[PDB]
A paper describes a structure:
Sodium/proton exchanger 1 (NHE1) is an electroneutral secondary active transporter present on the plasma membrane of most mammalian cells and plays critical roles in regulating intracellular pH and volume homeostasis. We find that NHE1 assembles as a symmetrical homodimer, with each subunit undergoing an elevator-like conformational change during cation exchange. Each monomer is made up of a dimerization domain (TMs 1−3 and 7−10) and a core domain (TMs 4−6 and 11−13).
Superposition of the complex structures determined under different conditions demonstrates that the NHE1 dimer structures are nearly identical in the presence of Na+ ions, at either pH 7.5 or pH 6.5, with a root-mean-square deviation (RMSD) of 0.6 Å for 840 Cα-atom pairs. Upon the structural superposition, it is apparent that the cation binding site of PaNhaP is conserved in NHE1.
Author numbering:
A (entry chain B), B (entry chain A): 87 to 506
Amino acid sequence: KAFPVLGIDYTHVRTPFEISLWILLACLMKIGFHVIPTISSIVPESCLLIVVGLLVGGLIKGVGETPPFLQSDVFFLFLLPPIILDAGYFLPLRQFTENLGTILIFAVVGTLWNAFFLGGLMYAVCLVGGEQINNIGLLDNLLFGSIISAVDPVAVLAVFEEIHINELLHILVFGESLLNDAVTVVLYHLFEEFANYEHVGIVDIFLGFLSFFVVALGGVLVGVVYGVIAAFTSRFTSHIRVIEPLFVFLYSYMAYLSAELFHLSGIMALIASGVVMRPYVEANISHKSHTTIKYFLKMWSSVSETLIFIFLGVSTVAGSHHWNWTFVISTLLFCLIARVLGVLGLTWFINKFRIVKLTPKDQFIIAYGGLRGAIAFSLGYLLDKKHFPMCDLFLTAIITVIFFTVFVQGMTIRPLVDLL
Amino acid sequence: KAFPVLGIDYTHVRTPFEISLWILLACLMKIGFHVIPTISSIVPESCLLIVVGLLVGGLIKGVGETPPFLQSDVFFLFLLPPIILDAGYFLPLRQFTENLGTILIFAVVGTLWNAFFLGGLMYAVCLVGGEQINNIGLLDNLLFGSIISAVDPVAVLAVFEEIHINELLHILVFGESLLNDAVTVVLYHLFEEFANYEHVGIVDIFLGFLSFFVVALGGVLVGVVYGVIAAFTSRFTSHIRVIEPLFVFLYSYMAYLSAELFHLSGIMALIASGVVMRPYVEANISHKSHTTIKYFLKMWSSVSETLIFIFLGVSTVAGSHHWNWTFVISTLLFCLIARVLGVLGLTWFINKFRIVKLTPKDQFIIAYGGLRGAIAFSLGYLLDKKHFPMCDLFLTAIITVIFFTVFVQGMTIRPLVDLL
């Protein structure tokens, strides 16, 4: 062997190199996405992430080598908590606790309505059209309804500006997105656990409801415990001003992992820890350290969302698909109808309770404009084949819903709202 | 199964939870290390990291479960480039290119001298005392000499202050540490490759020398290419001010990985990329983005060094040891003598070339005070057992050298320098 050390060893650096290449491509085309005169306020960033994922998936398909995949743990352990922490750390408490009732009712009850309505009506149409979807079942369909109700409405706010977005609408969609991402994951775990055993009774359903509430609240309690501990430690960190962000991220991640240890709601725990610590930091912390906390949250969340959408593109271009016309058309039309009905009913019921009525403007913004992405795909994609034999059909439906609700309900929300 | 979702599943979150627990313990005891009236300027941070690693190793030994380990790739791919980027990104060019000759000669020639002198003299004493080290060999001993010459003198600067540290001494120890960490890894790969085949000739030695230079310079060239590309892209990133740090880190890491792809010097490539980009960033970048670049470099380097030293503590408490009195005493005394002789000779030879003589002050600071750590241990620890059957003895010697040169040559450097 001439030239002793020199080599061409590529298998050594394949995961880090390709991951860095994907992130670099996404960021490069993101800075190529803002220089365009007016596209930043015409399409959401979600469209850009879809397009980047499509390009990378096309590249991988052209190369022909094995497509990468999330190993059902990298997601829940390293890609979800960044997104959740970026969202929940910048939650404005003054205008959150001011209307916690409305945000809570929308997030929880609207997600439960959307999930159960989609699951039930998808199951009903599965009973109708058969021979490819005839054998779906209920508990296998409520899971699809829950993982397709993981809506992300805050992505649409990049299309609007200071007007058309009240104080109330912004925090409302913020809380909907955040607590919806929590509740959909809790429901995902609940239904995935029920799917195993075929003997489900009234007692089992009651225990499932009880366990839903126990999971959510136990996550919350773990969050408060770790947030209080983080506040106490941040009050003792004047001397070394470089590790303060590291304490914030470490305590949030440990709250998430301690919740996930008991199968409690890690998302709720992380949100609670961030919310509880926020006021108690920024008062004991340098302004530079606060700024770098914000910057690292933004950057790390952007990287996680980018990687998830890259996997979405790889799965949609270089994946197996089970297009069924009835199921896909039914799920699109029924997710839209369920969202609209839920929003209308909930606004009608709460406007009999609040001093400031939710205007039809914001009702339309919430109903038509709630767009999936980056959690719905990931939650549906980690469904194994050992259970849920129609998980390929579930991915096809979820990908179709994501594409339709990001490229149509998100790109054509700004003009229809002027047509009020 | 009552309580459907509730569980106690710990194997799911074991690596992330224990890693976060270690980092939290280290940072907590770091902030407990600065509040002490005067210990920050009495001992280096290296001593604190050794103590944290010892405590965590004792905890793991008490628990009794399997000790974690670096899989020979996590180090070179995720723990080395953080340290190297923190060091080389803050390299002051004005006072680096001003005396590049002296820094370069110290780093390269002094490391080569230290490595070859230690290897040869360790081999000579191995020929003398036997029955446990009688069968070591030369090429198996030059590798130990190289991996024990990975000195980190900048750790001692935390013990001094604005006086006793000239303009020249600071940049000199900085460059020594940085380019020494590069050269020792290049030599590690060279000797690890030679160790395989037992038929080494004059042609092979010449080719090894040639390949050493080719590896170093090819790393440098990859570094300049990626640094120029990073500068060009940073000049086009005014619009989105949140991804600028992400471009910096992405381009540095891609330079490192592209160098490691060809087995070139990844450390040299990363240093070159950072140096080449630095002036061309901070002129096209927001001040906040520059500050967060600095903060993330510091924090991520601190985390990597902490994890490496935690592994050091785990290996020294919960590892297998092959204490040999002659080898250990010989390596301590000979590493000290080699360092002193190399420093004295090189300063004598270059003070006949420079206008500003290197004073005996800084000669003593460099010679006695060059302390190993966080690279020497890791480089020695990734030695397999399939080759190098005495790698246990090599770890024992390296750990002993680290402890002695951090707790003795680093803790008792500040008083002996007053005794000038």
